[PDB]
Amino acid sequence: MELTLGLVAIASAILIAFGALGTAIGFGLLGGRFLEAVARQPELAPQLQTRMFLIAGLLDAVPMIGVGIGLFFIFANPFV
Amino acid sequence: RRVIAHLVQANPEYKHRYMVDRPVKRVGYIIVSSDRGLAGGLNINLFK
């Protein structure tokens, strides 16, 4: 039961860190390639950044979801 | 020249010394002429 609580803590840690890794990879790839691309075409930077933030938003939804639900269980644990 | 222009509009990232003039200190001249005269002053007009 308290060890069940430890289970919950572990699960939340899993989600938060492991989705954080999801973000850490996606955003990094996007940054590297985006810098390279804008270097190739240094003129239309506005739309470039526009679609860049587009993709960034499309990216990190579900990892942040896991983070949020993990913290929720950390504090508003169902069946404490 | 067509594909050259396509390149440069595609890649305006630079202009080489072969497309844009740097300040000149010596200027080169490619001078064509003949080995047989008897052609008026055509060559002579060019020389002038």
Side-chain angles (χ1 to χ4, degrees):
Chain A
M1 72 291 291
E2 80 180 11
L3 322 170
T4 298
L5 292 164
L7 290 164
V8 186
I10 294 314
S12 300
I14 297 169
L15 273 293
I16 62 170
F18 167 88
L21 177 63
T23 52
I25 303 302
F27 280 158
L29 297 174
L30 276 296
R33 280 303 180 273
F34 173 86
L35 292 195
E36 302 162 84
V38 305
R40 190 185 151 250
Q41 303 312 321
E43 62 286 356
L44 191 62
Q47 322 317 114
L48 294 174
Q49 300 140 342
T50 307
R51 277 70 174 175
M52 183 278 288
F53 293 102
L54 161 63
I55 301 299
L58 310 180
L59 187 153
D60 62 358
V62 183
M64 296 299 102
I65 302 299
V67 183
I69 189 64
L71 273 293
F72 170 82
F73 280 43
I74 297 169
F75 307 113
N77 178 31
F79 310 102
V80 179
Chain B
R1 264 184 329 287
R2 150 179 75 78
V3 293
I4 281 164
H6 161 85
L7 178 62
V8 298
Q9 57 83 23
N11 287 335
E13 295 199 310
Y14 37 75
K15 292 179 179 179
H16 194 237
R17 293 182 183 174
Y18 299 154
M19 283 74 74
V20 59
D21 200 6
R22 57 163 182 263
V24 308
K25 289 80 177 174
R26 298 176 182 88
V27 290
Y29 279 77
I30 322 175
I31 316 183
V32 299
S33 68
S34 175
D35 311 341
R36 303 312 302 160
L38 309 190
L42 171 81
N43 299 312
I44 301 309
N45 307 317
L46 185 49
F47 306 151
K48 297 161 156 191

PDB file of all heavy atoms in Angstrom, chain A residues 39-42, chain B residues 10-13:
ATOM      1  N   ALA A  39      20.337  28.591 -42.654  1.00  0.00           N
ATOM      2  CA  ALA A  39      21.624  28.949 -43.229  1.00  0.00           C
ATOM      3  C   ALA A  39      21.571  28.849 -44.745  1.00  0.00           C
ATOM      4  O   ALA A  39      22.065  29.729 -45.457  1.00  0.00           O
ATOM      5  CB  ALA A  39      22.719  28.053 -42.657  1.00  0.00           C
ATOM      6  N   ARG A  40      20.951  27.786 -45.259  1.00  0.00           N
ATOM      7  CA  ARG A  40      20.820  27.655 -46.705  1.00  0.00           C
ATOM      8  C   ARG A  40      19.985  28.787 -47.291  1.00  0.00           C
ATOM      9  O   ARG A  40      20.293  29.301 -48.373  1.00  0.00           O
ATOM     10  CB  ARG A  40      20.211  26.303 -47.060  1.00  0.00           C
ATOM     11  CG  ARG A  40      20.267  25.991 -48.540  1.00  0.00           C
ATOM     12  CD  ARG A  40      19.555  24.694 -48.860  1.00  0.00           C
ATOM     13  NE  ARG A  40      18.999  24.706 -50.208  1.00  0.00           N
ATOM     14  CZ  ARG A  40      17.701  24.766 -50.476  1.00  0.00           C
ATOM     15  NH1 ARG A  40      16.823  24.821 -49.486  1.00  0.00           N
ATOM     16  NH2 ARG A  40      17.283  24.773 -51.732  1.00  0.00           N
ATOM     17  N   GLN A  41      18.928  29.194 -46.593  1.00  0.00           N
ATOM     18  CA  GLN A  41      18.000  30.215 -47.077  1.00  0.00           C
ATOM     19  C   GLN A  41      17.837  31.283 -46.006  1.00  0.00           C
ATOM     20  O   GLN A  41      16.819  31.333 -45.304  1.00  0.00           O
ATOM     21  CB  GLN A  41      16.657  29.596 -47.459  1.00  0.00           C
ATOM     22  CG  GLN A  41      16.759  28.498 -48.505  1.00  0.00           C
ATOM     23  CD  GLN A  41      17.614  28.898 -49.692  1.00  0.00           C
ATOM     24  OE1 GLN A  41      17.562  30.036 -50.158  1.00  0.00           O
ATOM     25  NE2 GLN A  41      18.406  27.960 -50.192  1.00  0.00           N
ATOM     26  N   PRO A  42      18.824  32.170 -45.864  1.00  0.00           N
ATOM     27  CA  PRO A  42      18.786  33.167 -44.785  1.00  0.00           C
ATOM     28  C   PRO A  42      17.797  34.297 -45.000  1.00  0.00           C
ATOM     29  O   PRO A  42      17.813  35.258 -44.223  1.00  0.00           O
ATOM     30  CB  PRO A  42      20.218  33.708 -44.772  1.00  0.00           C
ATOM     31  CG  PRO A  42      20.701  33.502 -46.163  1.00  0.00           C
ATOM     32  CD  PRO A  42      20.083  32.222 -46.625  1.00  0.00           C
TER      33      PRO A  42
ATOM     34  N   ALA B  10      18.841  30.445 -57.275  1.00  0.00           N
ATOM     35  CA  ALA B  10      18.656  29.413 -56.266  1.00  0.00           C
ATOM     36  C   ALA B  10      19.644  29.590 -55.122  1.00  0.00           C
ATOM     37  O   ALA B  10      19.302  29.379 -53.953  1.00  0.00           O
ATOM     38  CB  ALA B  10      18.803  28.032 -56.901  1.00  0.00           C
ATOM     39  N   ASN B  11      20.878  29.984 -55.439  1.00  0.00           N
ATOM     40  CA  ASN B  11      21.929  30.151 -54.440  1.00  0.00           C
ATOM     41  C   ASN B  11      22.513  31.553 -54.538  1.00  0.00           C
ATOM     42  O   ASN B  11      23.602  31.742 -55.100  1.00  0.00           O
ATOM     43  CB  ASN B  11      23.020  29.096 -54.617  1.00  0.00           C
ATOM     44  CG  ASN B  11      22.566  27.723 -54.183  1.00  0.00           C
ATOM     45  OD1 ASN B  11      21.662  27.590 -53.360  1.00  0.00           O
ATOM     46  ND2 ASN B  11      23.190  26.691 -54.735  1.00  0.00           N
ATOM     47  N   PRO B  12      21.836  32.566 -54.005  1.00  0.00           N
ATOM     48  CA  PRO B  12      22.411  33.915 -53.941  1.00  0.00           C
ATOM     49  C   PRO B  12      23.372  34.121 -52.780  1.00  0.00           C
ATOM     50  O   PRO B  12      23.671  35.271 -52.447  1.00  0.00           O
ATOM     51  CB  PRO B  12      21.164  34.789 -53.762  1.00  0.00           C
ATOM     52  CG  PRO B  12      20.215  33.922 -52.998  1.00  0.00           C
ATOM     53  CD  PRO B  12      20.539  32.483 -53.316  1.00  0.00           C
ATOM     54  N   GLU B  13      23.851  33.034 -52.179  1.00  0.00           N
ATOM     55  CA  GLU B  13      24.578  33.106 -50.921  1.00  0.00           C
ATOM     56  C   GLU B  13      25.911  33.825 -51.054  1.00  0.00           C
ATOM     57  O   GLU B  13      26.516  34.175 -50.035  1.00  0.00           O
ATOM     58  CB  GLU B  13      24.794  31.691 -50.397  1.00  0.00           C
ATOM     59  CG  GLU B  13      23.505  30.980 -50.037  1.00  0.00           C
ATOM     60  CD  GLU B  13      23.732  29.806 -49.113  1.00  0.00           C
ATOM     61  OE1 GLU B  13      24.614  28.977 -49.417  1.00  0.00           O
ATOM     62  OE2 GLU B  13      23.030  29.710 -48.085  1.00  0.00           O
TER      63      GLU B  13
END
